[PDB]
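This part of the workshop introduces the protein records we will be handling. A record pairs a protein's sequence with a compact description of its fold. Comparing a sequence with its tokens is the quickest way to learn the format. To make this concrete, we reproduce a full record directly below:
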Amino acid sequence: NAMRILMLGNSLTTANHMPDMLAELLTAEVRVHARGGARLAEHLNPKTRNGALTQAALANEAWDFVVMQEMSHGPATSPTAYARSVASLSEAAKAAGAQPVIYGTWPYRAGCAKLVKLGMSHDDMSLRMAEAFAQAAADSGALLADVAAPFRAGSADELYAADGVHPSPAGSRLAALVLAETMG
């Protein structure tokens, strides 16, 4: 059977045709449940469009993997909400016979306006995000696609969009490659 991947996320997932890139890398069918500004908790709530879509997909279709991407500062600013969302979505994925995957994202670029507004240092965000993903991977048994690591190893001018939050096309390509490695 061809590999089938369900991705839950927001513009960090959909930007720069990243799902299409991942699909071509893995020769996979990729379904995306995303909206700008979405949080993972929506997928647990069938009253939302994402929740209804995700409930139906897990009830009606067959998946190899379910990729979970949280709102970009959520793991840092609402760590408990994040942890509970991943836990419950991971259990739902496993119950459906799919392997859950965390799309681990990156701290915002040091000095950027969105990080200034959060009142959080770059180091604090870096550590909070890393801790959140590590703990969620361990607790849930989800595979971690750690995109923060190569972001840190790489060039910030290359990998970030102007806002220091969203990925550039190169940053999206990097996320696709990391996700493909994780699921390959």
DSSP finds ten helices and five strands in the chain. The beta strands are 4-9, 29-34, 65-68, 99-104, 143-146.
